[PDB]
Each structure stands twice: as C-alpha cells, then as structure tokens.
Amino acid sequence: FGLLWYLKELRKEEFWKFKELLKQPLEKFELKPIPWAELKKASKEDVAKLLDKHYPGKQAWEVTLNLFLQINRKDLWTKAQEEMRNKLN
Structure with a gap:
C-alpha cells in the first residue's frame, strides 16, 4: 500500500478531516x-x-492527492507527484 506511506504523515487533526471528506x-x-x-x-x-x-x-491516488490539497498538506501532494514522475522514466 504505497498510499499508506503518505497517509502516515497526517497528524491527528488532518487525518480526522481526511476521513470526514471521504464520506x-x-x-x-x-x-x-x-x-x-x-x-x-x-x-x-x-x-x-x-x-x-x-x-x-x-x-485512489486521485482522491487521496485531492484531499491532501484540501487539508493543507501540499507537501505530501508534491512528494507523491515526484514518485509518480520517477516511475514514468
């Protein structure tokens, strides 16, 4: 679950918002x-x-990344894009 590698970086309040946005x-x-x-x-x-x-x-990546942006974790967005670009080489 490569998704979990980024999800683990959410702090408690950001993760609560992330789950509320999913519903x-x-x-x-x-x-x-x-x-x-x-x-x-x-x-x-x-x-x-x-x-x-x-x-x-x-x-799943589309949703997760969009939610990262909504909870002010654009740092995680940028890291995830970087991994995806590296896979395209």
Missing part, C-alpha cells in the same frame, strides 16, 4: 463516497485498505 460527496471525480459506517474508528492502515477497495487503480 462527503466527491464532486471533482463523481465517485461514490465511502459509506460512513465503514470508517468507524478507522486507523491509517484501515483507510489505505478502504481506498483500494472502493477506488482501485489510479482513482
């Missing part, structure tokens, strides 16, 4: 939000698994 309408991608019942006491590892269950493929 709300995802208007930029017209995807279905994660049903709220599934995020009851979800740890960082659990969220990484839910992202891969619900938004497999590039979708």
Whole structure:
C-alpha cells in the first residue's frame, strides 16, 4: 500500500478531516463516497485498505492527492507527484 506511506504523515487533526471528506460527496471525480459506517474508528492502515477497495487503480491516488490539497498538506501532494514522475522514466 504505497498510499499508506503518505497517509502516515497526517497528524491527528488532518487525518480526522481526511476521513470526514471521504464520506462527503466527491464532486471533482463523481465517485461514490465511502459509506460512513465503514470508517468507524478507522486507523491509517484501515483507510489505505478502504481506498483500494472502493477506488482501485489510479482513482485512489486521485482522491487521496485531492484531499491532501484540501487539508493543507501540499507537501505530501508534491512528494507523491515526484514518485509518480520517477516511475514514468
């Protein structure tokens, strides 16, 4: 779960916002939000698994990166893009 490598960097309040945003309408991608019942006491590892269950493929990364921007972690956005660009070489 390469997603978890970045998710682990969220501090407590940023992670709470991240989970709340996952349950709300995802208007930029017209995807279905994660049903709220599934995020009851979800740890960082659990969220990484839910992202891969619900938004497999590039979708999970698209969602996660967009949420990073909404919770003011553009540092993590930039790091994730850098990894993805390095994979294209």
